[PDB]
Amino acid sequence: MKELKYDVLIIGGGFAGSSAAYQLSRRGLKILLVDSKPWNRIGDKPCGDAVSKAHFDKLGMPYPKGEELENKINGIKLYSPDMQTVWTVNGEGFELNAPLYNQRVLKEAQDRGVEIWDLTTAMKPIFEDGYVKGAVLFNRRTNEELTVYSKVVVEATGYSRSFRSKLPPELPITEDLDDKDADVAYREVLLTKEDIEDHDYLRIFFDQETSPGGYWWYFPKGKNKVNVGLGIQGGMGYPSIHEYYKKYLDKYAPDVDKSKLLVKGGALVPTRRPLYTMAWNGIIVIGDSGFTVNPVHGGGKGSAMISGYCAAKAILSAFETGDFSASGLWDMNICYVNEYGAKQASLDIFRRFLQKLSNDDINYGMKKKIIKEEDLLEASEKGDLHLSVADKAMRVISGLGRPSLLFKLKAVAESMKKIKELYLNYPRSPSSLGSWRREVDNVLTEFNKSLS
């Protein structure tokens, strides 16, 4: 067959893949990006389309303008199980036309020198001499089966992880996803009969009965258009998520017009720490495939762009030394952990706590205000549950007369602090990965026992 040689091969054109191609362009590298979907359908994976504005500023990513921005978000309303307590969290964000913005990032990168092939599926990985040296692509637009050699393969195939799962199991980069370390989510976009009250505010509904292990959401894309859905923890035995959706839709969205359904669908969402290593010999993994999603609120489009940013930095550093080994691309792990990875690991522990709280615990926790707004987003933006804040919350929990998991809040905050420092002390060399990984597991396996 035909053989082509590129510097970098990016597999997947979503938020992770496109951001990687954007940050890498115009810097002396021959780059190729592929995606199984047609160009007009790239990035149409079922999503809440809600991304913080801060992610666009930090990474130097272009703001979503025009049709790419459906609605401006100024805050989030958090609802208690009994609907009696409603917390208000402020912060600027964007309700996106995800495919429209994702395609502009691609098009701009294409104008900067990056070659893009749509309707192209990475089938077989090229693994020779213990290194990832490219992939066998199938462009069904031209019905060609091309063999593309590359120094570094960027894996951004989404949650499906279709490429890196075909690599040898001896590679640490082939770490799989445990069923309980992920959530299944489903969403629909409908038009509303009445105008949406506070359409600049996202609504998030907490309920372990209507959405066990996750939550319901109500994301206005306009004055009369809303993204409504839910998410539940997988590997627990729960019935189909569509049953939960169909049963409790009217409770969280009675104003929707069910005859004006625009889109519908769902997908798997990783809710854990990132891959222990997101880079190995001739390969970097980013996005859902590298488990980049915030374990608490399930937002992984912002962190995907972060992983792509760190992928670009690591690759440029690799070519700067002529080293495409794991030790050469190791800045990918260092960059991402400091940027978002260390936060994930901490929230990974906090997630396991929140998923095991009853509705009575959540109702009590919100009404009695165990934590204020000043400390809440301080936890979901930095991953830090300060020991001073945990003490102030425990003094409130001490006024509870019934047995509850809430009484272990201080122990949780200490475990989060421990695993936080453990991730900030990420192994400098791949030779220390094995030892560090087993230490992390010991923290997690111990914490899982402490919740019983």
Ligand SMILES: Cc1cc2c(cc1C)N(C[C@H](O)[C@H](O)[C@H](O)COP(=O)(O)OP(=O)(O)OC[C@H]1O[C@@H](n3cnc4c(N)ncnc43)[C@H](O)[C@@H]1O)c1[nH]c(=O)[nH]c(=O)c1N2
């Ligand atoms: C229902 C629901 C709701 C939400 C969310 C998820 C879900 C399922 N998320 C998470 C968010 O959708 C997700 O984490 C990001 O899109 C991750 O970006 P990726 O590009 O890695 O994924 P994505 O899945 O978009 O990337 C995969 C891409 O690669 C392509 N591909 C796959 N295999 C391939 C192969 N072998 N060869 C070539 N191409 C291949 C696919 O076709 C696709 O285009 C979210 N996030 C957030 O921050 N805010 C939110 O509000 C939500 N809400």
